Amino acid sequence: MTDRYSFSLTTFSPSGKLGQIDYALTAVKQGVTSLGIKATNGVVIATEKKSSSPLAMSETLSKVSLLTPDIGAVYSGMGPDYRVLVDKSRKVAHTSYKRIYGEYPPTKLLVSEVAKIMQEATQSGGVRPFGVSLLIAGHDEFNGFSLYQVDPSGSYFPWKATAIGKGSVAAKTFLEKRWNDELELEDAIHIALLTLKESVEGEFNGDTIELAIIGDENPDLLGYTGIPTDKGPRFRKLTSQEINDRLEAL
């Protein structure tokens, strides 16, 4: 008969490549269009939120979470698939690093540990890997700014500008269309708004659009003063009221 839809849990794919990954990438393609732009002085990520019912509160859905103050993340796919992954991903960064080195996890170690959970889901039978794709953007002292595309197959690669979701193929050219590596962060946000606007024309406001940036530390989000050594959070989530300010200036 046809294939049994194996992750290589108990069975290797006879076709030479796993067929359900493309069906898991179909669940990735099922997700909203989410993009990111890696520049020299900062990294910006943009994504759209599903409206669903008109009475659903838009502030409840957060498609950009906080792992470490210097590293942001954005995802496209099923809702509960991202929560179970990150709830376990946080405990990995705490025990394997923060309970040992007692600092904030860098960009190289944190992204690698997130992909290891997907590797265990593919290896351990009976547990289906989650079909969400995560775009992790962060800034550390060692490697600096970084933008990585985490695939459900367990592979990650750096990208200057990349997109996931239904517009993964379409917006990838659109990001390369208006943006180049020589551009800075300020001109990158305007490009991210123009590219994400082409995804849906219904509502471009901050209610259904969640925009976040990575950049210079903000002392207002540090929560304390008096210590010059400890750096402030490099990730600042843009309020929906502030998102409309960038729309009028777009």
> Is residue 161 near another protein by the rule CB under 8 A?
yes
Least distance (Å) from another protein to the CB of residue 228?
A: 31
Order of strands across the sheet that contains 145-150: 64-68, 71-76, 133-139, 145-150
Among residues 187, 244, 180, which one has the least CA distance to residue 211? 244
- Binding to another protein in span 168-227, by CB under 8 A: 172, 175-176
Asked if 20 contacts 4 with a C-beta cutoff of 8 angstroms, the reply is no
The answer to whether 79 contacts another protein (rule: CB under 8 A) is yes
Residue whose CB is less far from another protein, 88 or 230: 88
Which residue lies nearer to another protein by CB, 127 or 218? 127
In the set 33, 47, 68, 162, which binds another protein (CB under 8 A)? 162
Provide CB contacts within 8 A for 115, sequence distance 6+. Answer: 150, 154, 155, 156
Mask 104-143, x = binds another protein (CB under 8 A)?
--------x--xx-xx--xx-xxxx-xx-----------x
Q: Does 91 bind another protein (CB under 8 A)?
A: no
Question: Which residue in the set 40, 41, 95, 155 belongs to the binding site for another protein (CB under 8 A)?
Answer: 155
- Least CB distance to another protein at residue 224 (A): 22
Query: How many residues bind another protein, per CB under 8 A?
Result: 62
- Residues whose CB falls within 8 Å of the CB of residue 207, separated by 6 or more in sequence, listed in order: 49, 58, 240
Across 178-205, b (16+ Cβ under 10 Å) vs e yields ebeeebebeebbbbbbebbeebbeeebe
Taking residues 49 to 68 in sequence order and writing x for each that binds another protein by CB under 8 A, - otherwise, the string is ---xxxxxx-xxx-------
In the complex with another protein, which residue's Cβ is closer, 11 or 218? 11
Q: Phi then psi for 78, rounded to 5 degrees? A: -65, 150
Sign (positive or negative) of CA dihedral 201, 202, 204, 208: negative
Pick between residue 150 and residue 189 the one whose CB is nearest to another protein. Answer: 150
Kindly state whether residue 69 participates in binding another protein, applying the rule CB under 8 A.
Answer: no
If the CB atoms of residues 6 and 226 are measured against another protein, the closer one turns out to be 6
103 belongs to the binding site for another protein (CB under 8 A): no
For residue 67, what are its two tokens? 């792992």
Please, which residues have CB within 8 angstroms of residue 247's CB and are 6 or more apart in sequence? Answer: 193, 204, 205, 206
d(CA 243, CA 212) in angstroms, rounded, equals 9
Query: Contact residues for another protein (CB under 8 A)?
Result: 4-5, 7-17, 20, 23-24, 26-27, 29-30, 38, 52-57, 59-61, 79-81, 83-84, 87, 112, 115-116, 118-119, 122-123, 125-128, 130-131, 143, 153-155, 157-162, 172, 175-176
